[PDB]
Amino acid sequence: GSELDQLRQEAEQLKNQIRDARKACADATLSQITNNIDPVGRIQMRTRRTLRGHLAKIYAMHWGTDSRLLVSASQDGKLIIWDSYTTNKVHAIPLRSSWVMTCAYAPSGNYVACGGLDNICSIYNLKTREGNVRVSRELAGHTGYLSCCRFLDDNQIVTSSGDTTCALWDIETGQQTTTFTGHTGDVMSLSLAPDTRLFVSGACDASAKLWDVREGMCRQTFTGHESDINAICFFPNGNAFATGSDDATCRLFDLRADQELMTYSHDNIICGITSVSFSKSGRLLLAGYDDFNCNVWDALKADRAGVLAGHDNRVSCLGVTDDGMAVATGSWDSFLKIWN
Amino acid sequence: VQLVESGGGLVQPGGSRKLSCSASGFAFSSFGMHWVRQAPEKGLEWVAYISSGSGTIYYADTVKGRFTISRDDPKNTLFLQMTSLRSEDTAMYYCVRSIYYYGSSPFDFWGQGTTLTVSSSDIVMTQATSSVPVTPGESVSISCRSSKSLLHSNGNTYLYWFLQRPGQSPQLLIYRMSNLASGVPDRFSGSGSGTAFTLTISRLEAEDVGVYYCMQHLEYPLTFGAGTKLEL
Amino acid sequence: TASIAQARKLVEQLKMEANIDRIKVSKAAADLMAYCEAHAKEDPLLTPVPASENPFR
Amino acid sequence: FLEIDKKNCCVFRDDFIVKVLPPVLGLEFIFGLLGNGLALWIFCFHLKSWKSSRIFLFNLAVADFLLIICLPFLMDNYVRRWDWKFGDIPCRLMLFMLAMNRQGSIIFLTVVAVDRYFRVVHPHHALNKISNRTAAIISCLLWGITIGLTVHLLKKKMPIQNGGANLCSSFSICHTFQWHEAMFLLEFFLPLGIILFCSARIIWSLRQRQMDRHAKIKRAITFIMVVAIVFVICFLPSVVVRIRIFWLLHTSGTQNCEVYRSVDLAFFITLSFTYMNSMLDPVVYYFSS
Amino acid sequence: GCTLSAEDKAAVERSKMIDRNLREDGEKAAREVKLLLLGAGESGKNTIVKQMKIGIVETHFTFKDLHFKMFDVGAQRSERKKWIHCFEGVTAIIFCVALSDYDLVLAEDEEMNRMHASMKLFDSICNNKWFTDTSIILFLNKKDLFEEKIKKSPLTICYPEYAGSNTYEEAAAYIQCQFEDLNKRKDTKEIYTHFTCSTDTKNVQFVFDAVTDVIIKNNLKDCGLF
Ligand SMILES: Cc1c(C(=O)N[C@H](C)COc2ccccc2)cnc2c(-c3ccc(C(C)C)cc3)cnn12
Ligand SMILES: CC(C)CCC[C@@H](C)[C@H]1CC[C@H]2[C@@H]3CC=C4C[C@@H](O)CC[C@]4(C)[C@H]3CC[C@]12C
């Protein structure tokens, strides 16, 4: 009763204090100081390859770490591994549950991870002595659908689900080692830091949280959007990250100065974003939309400098290689394309 | 994982024969399969190749059209049929498995082969040495030379190094002249360029005694050099 | 009566997230500018790689 | 009029064909040209679906665009009262395009009506889900049984002396059994026995399931009768005239040709109905369907 | 074949066999009927499954040589706007409503009784953007107990604006019309309504007939005739 009111008032003035401390450290935005440099020219990228063979909507893709192999997942029930240079197919994997929503590639090349809408995260081994792929582990313990997964090393993995929970799993033993709690709504995405001692996650409560893998507690919270967060990614330096929301807006957040840096939006874009990704030097931000096409933003001046318009349905997933040679986009039309 | 060959023995001068292998322990339906000769006290030379799906077949120009490879995929049984036999077919035949996709390491598991004694252009691979005496602990080298470049345009170099111990079947050591097979120590290394190549050992143990062979896989026919033997 | 416990957890969190070190925004944005300036020659997509070594021709 | 090509044939040339046929073909050419040109542009630069039965209408749309550009030469032929001033070679193309782009419009006018039958009375079938690269095999074979029966009009020398002028005619009143004639009847009688059965069963099976209340599937019954009506209005009038010709050839021999003096004239008007389809084909199948 | 090496010519054939398998597996997914099952908890979904029994739960059965797969999502408890578009291309939606619940009052907010929640859920799933061309098969459940519960207590408690005689036939007819009045498409959408109470083989036959009509119309539209 009275304790409830006093605690609520205290927490509210704590929120006021956080806001005032955040506002006292801002004196100039990114546009002011970057108003000096020269804009990149219009980027023309052509479809160099077209990977085809999926029979339904494509939901996720991930680039292998050698910049030549990639994996993709569709509601057809298939997980496919491609060779980008020659357009060859290397492996096809059948799934037990058709309703998949994520996939990931291990940074060594030995494992892939899949899962969605079944509360499970399955781990497959690519390099076995018997010439096929068989399921190596099957992590259970979430009470909602899986919306992202990323390998930390060859024996750890991090997941986010629809029960407003993130988890860290030791694949060897098979149980959660750390549980990350604190969102109030469904968690839609996560991304790992370059050194893998931190990660960021984004949820349907219109906020983002930074987590510490070692000590397992929330470090920092980011607000400013107005709808779900569908996509999130780190800057190559590891000191910034960009979010893509459901209100036709992208945003850039800065870790050491917990502010908002810049907004990527236009008055003729009214539909939401599905995917966000960065360039090798962090000069380009690519965003996938559901107006059927992709957009390229000069990530330092907030103006559009290209369009990847070659898809017939919604653009669901998107990625850039580790050397920066190509871009891949997958679509609800069941096609994948590579741009250079 | 294992391959079991059968069918060998003493045959009449003019005759026929049938050789099988049973594959147990892996996914036989996704492996291309080779047959490979080796004469007594001599090198080993390739026979024939059937791919996964039984769509492509390659034969040995010394038996081309006089042999036949065949496959039974449901029951995991690979066949070779010698329709006509002659004096110079006295050897021992091995069966080797191989898979081709980006990053694979063909010629992994070599089978065990069966002996077969009969009653009585192509690239040039040359191992100039025949025997090498060397005491343990000190680094050793072996050399192999071609009649032309094996470096394709895409960047590969289809040179293979592998080893036969005294009384044993061979095992892959180096595929594509740079890469190391699975289960073998880092003591071995392969280097070279253009047409000339060297295999080397840094720390010498008592398990390296044997005979080394170099192969090329640039195109058919697949050609082997003579043996370069090492002694303790 | 779980409301007091949830409030305790929330107020602990609001205590601790108000207790970090902060820097200016101009310094970090200049750090972004520097990381962009010092890697410009290495990203193919920005300055188009010559047609003689991209493998997607 | 009795001339000898290799047979005993009558040939007539009246100052009446020039009075009626040129304007009729002008109407049948100035409309079919645009009617199939616009349809054929839409079927390749603005139709972005490409399912297994818009690659059976496309063949029908390219089997009558070719019997349109072939018409002005025959118009020239009649304006001059059976007088061919365009040399030997075109007189063998222009009698192979007409007789092959006509039988090749019937064939793709029947496949549509077997497609529909299988869609309606026999759902849950394999044949309704075929791929559009296994439907082009059938298109290429149906373009191969068409050309296969019309080549024998190429291996001849049609231009023939008629005393003064030259006649280029695949149709003549001769007294020998041929194969072109039997084809003229077979192109009509079999597709009738297919289309009528299909259109009766669709309409019956779409109304014993009480589905005849939705306002769009009560419009769908009419466009299954309209198509079967403009196939007996076009192709039938010129077939009973050939039966009449056969009866005239059989009741008396080819001894007094002027007996045919009337019936023959009628034929070359009624055959002008066979081109009529090719202009009201792309309105009851593509636009108003 | 000319530029390719000898090892790059076996990767191509491997990829072609992968293509063959992916193609031949897609002809078995397009030859099965998919249904999405919805209800309001104890709405008889369990017994309606029981009469047809062979995270998300999947049931499959067969009748007259036609494979059916029901997807039941009653345990998700998540925000439905994030995964409702996965079922965009199903054949039909089966909605189960128990009409022995005109007297029961829902627990969470005692004022509003359960059938009002059922009509809310029907009106929410019927007018979705993802299901604009999807048909809805409606089952009205527990009509046995309705007959005993209607005579003692009038349905005026839930339907004060109802002027009848509390007679079984017209009360049920009023309820069925009240449900079918929630539709707002009326041109590309049909609602099939059935009365069921532990009845045998009538539910299966009803589903088969309704799906046959759905597929007949879909085929007729596929060629441009509809
Ligand atoms: C005479 C004839 C000819 C013929 O050309 N005769 C010459 C003109 C010359 O005409 C004659 C007349 C009398 C005597 C000699 C020649 C062609 N087809 C047929 C048919 C036929 C009827 C139906 C069908 C099916 C319905 C599809 C097939 C063929 C039957 N008769 N017949
Ligand atoms: C769409 C699928 C079902 C194709 C079915 C159409 C096939 C089976 C049928 C329908 C109509 C048939 C054609 C009708 C027209 C003729 C003219 C006749 O002088 C020769 C046979 C021929 C050429 C038939 C060949 C076979 C045919 C094309």
Give the contacts of A137 (CB within 8 A, at least 6 positions apart). A122, A123, A171, A174
Specify if D14 maps to a domain. Answer: no
Nearest CA to B190 among B161, B154, B158? B161
DSSP assignment letter at A42: P
Pick the residue of A10, A44, A234, A256 with the most C CBs within 10 A to test the interface with C by mutation: A256
CB contact under 8 A, C15 and A33: no
Nearest CA to E78 among A96, A165, A150? A165
The domain containing residue D240 runs over which residues? 20-284
Give the SS3 label for residue D123. Answer: coil
Taking the C-alpha atoms of residue B162 and residue B181, their distance in angstroms, rounded to an integer, is: 10
- Chain D residues within 8 A of E30 when measuring between CB atoms: 129
Interface residue B18 vs chain E (CB under 8 A): no
Interface residue C2 vs chain A (CB under 8 A): no
Q: Which amino acid is at D181?
A: E
Nearest CA to B217 among B107, B59, B96, B103? B107
Q: Which secondary-structure segment (H or E) carries B129?
A: none
Instruction: Please tell me if the CB atom of residue D249 comes closer than 6 angstroms to any atom of ligand 1.
Output: yes
Alpha carbons within 13 angstroms on the beta-carbon side of residue C12 total: 9
- The partner residue sitting opposite B102, judged by closest CB among A83, A129, A131, is A83
CA of D176 to the centre of ligand 1 (A): 9
Nearest CA to D21 among D275, D259, D198, D228? D275
D110 Cα nearest atom in ligand 2: 11
Interface residue B101 vs chain A (CB under 8 A): yes
Interface residue B156 vs chain E (CB under 8 A): yes
Give the total number of structural domains in chain D: 1
Q: Which amino acid is at B118?
A: V
Taking the C-alpha atoms of residue B32 and residue D135, their distance in angstroms, rounded to an integer, is: 35
Give the distance from CA E186 to its chain's centroid: 18
Residue A288 backbone phi and psi in degrees, to 5: -95, 135
Q: Which ligand is in closest contact with the Cα of D114?
A: 2
If you take atom 24 of ligand 2, which residue's CA is the nearest one? D107
CATH number, domain containing residue C26: 4.10.260.10
**Cross-strand partners of A296:** A286
Residue B77 backbone phi and psi in degrees, to 5: -145, 115
Give the contacts of A42 (CB within 8 A, at least 6 positions apart). A305, A306
Q: What residue spans define the domains of chain A? A: 1-339
Taking the C-alpha atoms of residue A187 and residue A164, their distance in angstroms, rounded to an integer, is: 5
Q: Which amino acid is at D173?
A: I
Where is chain D discontinuous (C–N over 2.5 Å), named by the preceding residue? none
Residue E200 backbone phi and psi in degrees, to 5: -105, 135
- How many beta carbons lie within 10 A of that of residue B61, not counting itself? 10
Q: Is E102 exposed, middle or buried (0-12, 13-18, 19+ CB in 10 A)?
A: buried
Using an 8 Å Cβ cutoff, are E134 and E77 in contact?
no
List the end-to-end C-alpha distance of chain A, in Å, as a whole number. 63
If you take atom 25 of ligand 1, which residue's CA is the nearest one? D186
Using an 8 Å Cβ cutoff, are B10 and B119 in contact?
yes
Give the SS3 label for residue D24. Answer: helix
Q: What residue spans define the domains of chain E? A: 1-28, 32-215
Q: What residue spans define the domains of chain B? A: 2-118, 125-230
- How many beta carbons lie within 10 A of that of residue C13, not counting itself? 16
Residue D170 backbone phi and psi in degrees, to 5: -80, -10
Taking the C-alpha atoms of residue A39 and residue A35, their distance in angstroms, rounded to an integer, is: 10
Nearest CA to D53 among D104, D127, D121? D127
Min Cα–Cα distance to chain A from E77, Å: 8
Alpha carbons within 13 angstroms on the beta-carbon side of residue A195 total: 7
DSSP E81-107: GGTGGGGTT-SEEEEEEETT-SS-B-S
**Cross-strand partners of A241:** A234, A253
CATH superfamily of B125-230: Immunoglobulins (2.60.40.10)
Experimentally determined by: cryo-EM
Distances (CA, A) of A115 to A101, A189, E55: 6, 13, 12
Q: Is B139 exposed, middle or buried (0-12, 13-18, 19+ CB in 10 A)?
A: exposed
Taking the C-alpha atoms of residue D112 and residue D63, their distance in angstroms, rounded to an integer, is: 14
Specify if D75 maps to a domain. Answer: yes
CATH superfamily of A1-339: YVTN repeat-like/Quinoprotein amine dehydrogenase (2.130.10.10)
DSSP E30-74: TTSEEEEEE--SSSSHHHHHHTT----EEEEEESSS-EEEEEE-T
Instruction: Please tell me if the CB atom of residue D250 comes closer than 6 angstroms to any atom of ligand 1.
Output: yes
CATH number, domain B2-118: 2.60.40.10
Pick the residue of E211, E214, E216, E226 with the most D CBs within 10 A to test the interface with D by mutation: E216
The two three-digit tokens of residue C39, written as one number: 């890697």
Interface residue C28 vs chain A (CB under 8 A): yes
Using an 8 Å Cβ cutoff, are A326 and A63 in contact?
no
The two three-digit tokens of residue A14, written as one number: 């704590």
Using an 8 Å Cβ cutoff, are B185 and B207 in contact?
no
Instruction: Please tell me if the CB atom of residue D246 comes closer than 6 angstroms to any atom of ligand 1.
Output: yes
Q: Which amino acid is at D260?
A: Y
Taking the C-alpha atoms of residue D75 and residue B44, their distance in angstroms, rounded to an integer, is: 81
Q: What part of A 206-225 touches C (C-beta under 8 Å)? A: 218-221
Alpha carbons within 13 angstroms on the beta-carbon side of residue E217 total: 23
Interface residue B218 vs chain A (CB under 8 A): no
Q: Is D36 exposed, middle or buried (0-12, 13-18, 19+ CB in 10 A)?
A: buried
List the end-to-end C-alpha distance of chain D, in Å, as a whole number. 49
Give residue ranges of A with CB < 8 Å to any E CB.
53-55, 75-78, 80, 83, 86, 88-90, 92, 99, 117-120, 143-145, 162-163, 185-186, 188, 204, 228
Taking the C-alpha atoms of residue A33 and residue E65, their distance in angstroms, rounded to an integer, is: 70
- Chain E residues within 8 A of D119 when measuring between CB atoms: 219-220, 222-223
Taking the C-alpha atoms of residue E190 and residue E171, their distance in angstroms, rounded to an integer, is: 23
DSSP A212-243: ETTT-SEEEEEE--SS-EEEEEE-TTSSEEEE
Q: Dihedral of CA D91/D96/D99/D104: which sign?
A: negative
Q: Dihedral of CA D91/D93/D99/D101: which sign?
A: negative
Using an 8 Å Cβ cutoff, are A113 and E39 in contact?
no
The two three-digit tokens of residue B200, written as one number: 């080397």
Q: Which secondary-structure segment (H or E) carries A50?
A: strand A47-51
Using an 8 Å Cβ cutoff, are E213 and D209 in contact?
yes
Give the distance from CA A241 to its chain's centroid: 10
Resolution (Å) of this entry = 2.9
CB contact under 8 A, A34 and C14: no
Task: Report the C-alpha dihedral over residues B199, B201, B204, B208, rounded to 10 degrees.
Answer: -40
Q: Which amino acid is at B169?
A: S
D242 Cα nearest atom in ligand 1: 8
Whole-number CA gyration radius for chain D:
21
Specify if D220 maps to a domain. Answer: yes
- How many beta carbons lie within 10 A of that of residue A336, not counting itself? 24
Specify if D1 maps to a domain. Answer: no
D56 Cα nearest atom in ligand 2: 1
Using an 8 Å Cβ cutoff, are A199 and A158 in contact?
yes
CA of D242 to the centre of ligand 1 (A): 9
The two three-digit tokens of residue D163, written as one number: 């005393």
Give the SS3 label for residue A23. Answer: helix
DSSP E106-154: -SSSTTSBHHHHHHHHHHHHHT-GGGTT-EEEEEEE-HHHHHHHHHHS-
D62: left (phi over 0), alpha (psi -120 to 50) or beta: alpha
Pick the residue of B99, B102, B152, B179 with the most A CBs within 10 A to test the interface with A by mutation: B102
Taking the C-alpha atoms of residue E176 and residue E99, their distance in angstroms, rounded to an integer, is: 10
Our mutation pick for probing the ligand 1 site, out of D180, D181, D184, counting the most ligand atoms within 8 A of Cβ, is D181
Nearest CA to E80 among B181, B174, A117? A117
Q: Is B28 exposed, middle or buried (0-12, 13-18, 19+ CB in 10 A)?
A: buried
Using an 8 Å Cβ cutoff, are B131 and B231 in contact?
yes
Give the pairing type, strands B131-133 and B228-231.
parallel
CB contact under 8 A, B51 and E11: no
Q: Is D265 exposed, middle or buried (0-12, 13-18, 19+ CB in 10 A)?
A: middle
To 10 degrees, what angle do helices E168-180 and E114-126 make? 40
CB contact under 8 A, A283 and C36: yes
CB contact under 8 A, A117 and E15: no
Give the contacts of D121 (CB within 8 A, at least 6 positions apart). D201, D202, D205
Angle among Cα A47, A52, A53 to the nearest 5 degrees reads 175
Give the pairing type, strands B67-72 and B77-82.
antiparallel
- How many beta carbons lie within 10 A of that of residue D40, not counting itself? 17
The two three-digit tokens of residue D6, written as one number: 């290799």
Using an 8 Å Cβ cutoff, are A77 and A93 in contact?
no
Q: Which amino acid is at A187?
A: V
DSSP B25-90: SS-GGG-EEEEE---TTS---EEEEE-TTS--EE--TTTTTTEEEEEETTTTEEEEEESS--GGG-
Give the total number of structural domains in chain C: 1
Give the distance from CA D278 to its chain's centroid: 8
Alpha helices (H) along D129-179? 135-147
Q: Which amino acid is at A104?
A: A
Specify if D163 maps to a domain. Answer: yes
- The partner residue sitting opposite C28, judged by closest CB among A218, A256, A324, is A256
Taking the C-alpha atoms of residue B23 and residue B29, their distance in angstroms, rounded to an integer, is: 10
Taking the C-alpha atoms of residue C48 and residue A43, their distance in angstroms, rounded to an integer, is: 9
- The partner residue sitting opposite B27, judged by closest CB among A68, A83, A130, is A130
**Subunits adjacent to chain B (3 or more Cβ pairs under 8 Å):** A, E
Taking the C-alpha atoms of residue E79 and residue A244, their distance in angstroms, rounded to an integer, is: 19
Taking the C-alpha atoms of residue D56 and residue D175, their distance in angstroms, rounded to an integer, is: 39
- Chain A residues within 8 A of E21 when measuring between CB atoms: 92
Domain E32-215 CATH class label: alpha beta
Give the SS3 label for residue E169. Answer: helix
Give the contacts of B121 (CB within 8 A, at least 6 positions apart). none
Give the contacts of B164 (CB within 8 A, at least 6 positions apart). B170, B210, B211, B213
The two three-digit tokens of residue D269, written as one number: 């008007």
Give the distance from CA A87 to its chain's centroid: 25
Our mutation pick for probing the ligand 1 site, out of D185, D252, D259, counting the most ligand atoms within 8 A of Cβ, is D185
If you take atom 19 of ligand 1, which residue's CA is the nearest one? D182
Alpha helices (H) along chain D? 17-30, 32-45, 57-62, 66-69, 71-79, 90-93, 103-110, 112-120, 135-147, 180-205, 222-229, 237-251, 263-270, 277-282
Nearest CA to A45 among C33, C54, C39, C41? C54
**Cross-strand partners of B211:** B164, B229
Q: Which secondary-structure segment (H or E) carries A295?
A: strand A294-298
Taking the C-alpha atoms of residue A278 and residue A238, their distance in angstroms, rounded to an integer, is: 12
- How many beta carbons lie within 10 A of that of residue A104, not counting itself? 23
Specify if D8 maps to a domain. Answer: no
The two three-digit tokens of residue D136, written as one number: 């082009």
Q: What part of A 46-75 touches C (C-beta under 8 Å)? A: 48-49
